[PDB]
Design a protein around this ligand. Structure first.
Ligand code: IHP
Ligand code: A1CCZ
Lengths: 102, 102, 102, 102, 102, 102
């Protein structure tokens, strides 16, 4: 309880990129004595959960566990104005154009 | 009054995701020398009251004080990018289609 | 007048949680010499008048001086997506659906 | 002459609150050796023209002559999630309902 | 390339007021051994190019050849909520009232 | 491989201006022992790929290979309010007016 660097608290800021935070999930796992597959609940899940919902709305479409070159190119969409370029419109199309409910 | 790290002032930074804040509610409790049940208002309900309403509006849907993993996945959208990806659009259609008041 | 933080101007950040600013307000209440009832204007009404329009606007809805526990909950909306979810939902439909003037 | 901050341009930030920058120019008039009365037209006029379009827009609305406590009271409307929260209902409604031009 | 503070890489933060940054541009211009006219490229067009698109768009409206106090006056609008109130609203009116395309 | 700051991972902060990050990519290119022609592929492509999608959507529009002055001028639009001033008008019109899908 209250244990840091175990990924149980690693976190990507709203404006913090997936790539940069990945270093926080990799590097903070360096501090953690684990197995490579063990780290996979992270690389795949806490990397997808605590990491900037842009990554959720992204890794949910792109998919999770996408290679570091894929989740990179994609989660590079993550970002304050960086995602506003793409996500801004998406929510705007989630309501009116593409995902308009009823 | 003004006692720190007792959960009474632990709060979800409105931008701090539900996790960043839960963690704070957890680890800082290590410092708070309390009873396990006492920590239960602190985990269930503080985590539901002074926790940035983004996680509250969710937490209710999830059920208040639901398991941390459960409130975590749902409230991971709490934090910036999620509530902006999703809730911007949700409330928007609450106003127009789903929740049109009168 | 203008003595350091006499309450007369204590400030809540546009995003600073009410509980937090309240920490500054209380902290500076200590700095100024006021009877408790005298501090009551300082708590009940200043807190409403000069504390981040996120709370002050609400504080009009709860009425000036709603018990700090009620107001704590009201002003717990203060925040980015936590506040803006509500403010967006209310303002967006005020203009179009709920309060469309003329 | 016109050395920095003599009430030449004492500028207010965008989110920097009115009481924060008002505290600065008062302090900066101290930086300027002028008549007490001189400082009066400096605090009433120059302050208003060069300070935060949020409080500059308010300052016009209150209209000059508003005692500082009254200025800051209206300018307490200033702020990102703070003024924006009031600007959603205030300005987002100018384009559509209140200030619909032609 | 990447020459320190040669104006070419001097920049205005997206939020940085026009002036705060101009203090930088100028402050280093004094350091860049240049002719007055040369400094005038830095003031007329670079000043614009490397300066916060809130205002970069403005300085065109103002158009080059305007006094620094002229651009500054128009650029007190520069700012997050400072500029959003006038310009976000302008954008709000760019979709609905005045700049409605097609 | 994937040595730090070898350009393979150089990145632009979402808010980090294009010009700023470009200084991180160029400077770090100095750290990268690469043929100039190689560096060119890094300046043309990699600069485009990991440099803040604000620019990615811009550089794509301008066309890859645009001169740094050309990428810069447009990417000076990169930024929070700075890119938002344009992008908000754009994405908003991508859903409703110009890019309305179906
Ligand atoms: O994206 P950045 O340049 O890093 O800064 C952003 C941006 O603030 P600006 O108005 O200065 O551009 C957000 O503004 P929005 O476009 O989302 O309105 C703001 O949002 P809020 O005013 O709603 O708080 C957000 O904060 P957040 O991520 O908490 O939503 C804040 O980021 P930082 O606080 O991390 O600097
Ligand atoms: C209500 C609030 C929380 C403050 C909010 C809401 C929506 C957004 C983004 C979209 N959006 C959606 C998901 C993720 C991103 C992220 F940044 F994380 F990448 C993103 O940009 N659009 C608005 C931003 C803004 C500011 C003032 C004027 C207009 C707009 C449009 C940003 C913040």
């Amino acid at each position: 309880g209250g244990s840091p660097t175990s990924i149980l608290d690693i976190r990507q800021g709203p404006k913090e990129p997936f790539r940069d935070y990945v270093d926080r999930f990799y590097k903070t796992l360096r501090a953690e004595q684990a197995s490579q597959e063990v780290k996979n609940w992270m690389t795949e899940t806490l990397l997808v959960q605590n990491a900037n919902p842009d990554c959720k709305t992204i890794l949910k479409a792109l998919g999770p566990g996408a290679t570091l070159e894929e989740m990179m190119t994609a989660c590079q969409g993550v970002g304050g104005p960086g995602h506003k370029a793409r996500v801004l419109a998406e929510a705007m199309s989630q309501v009116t154009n593409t995902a308009t409910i009823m």
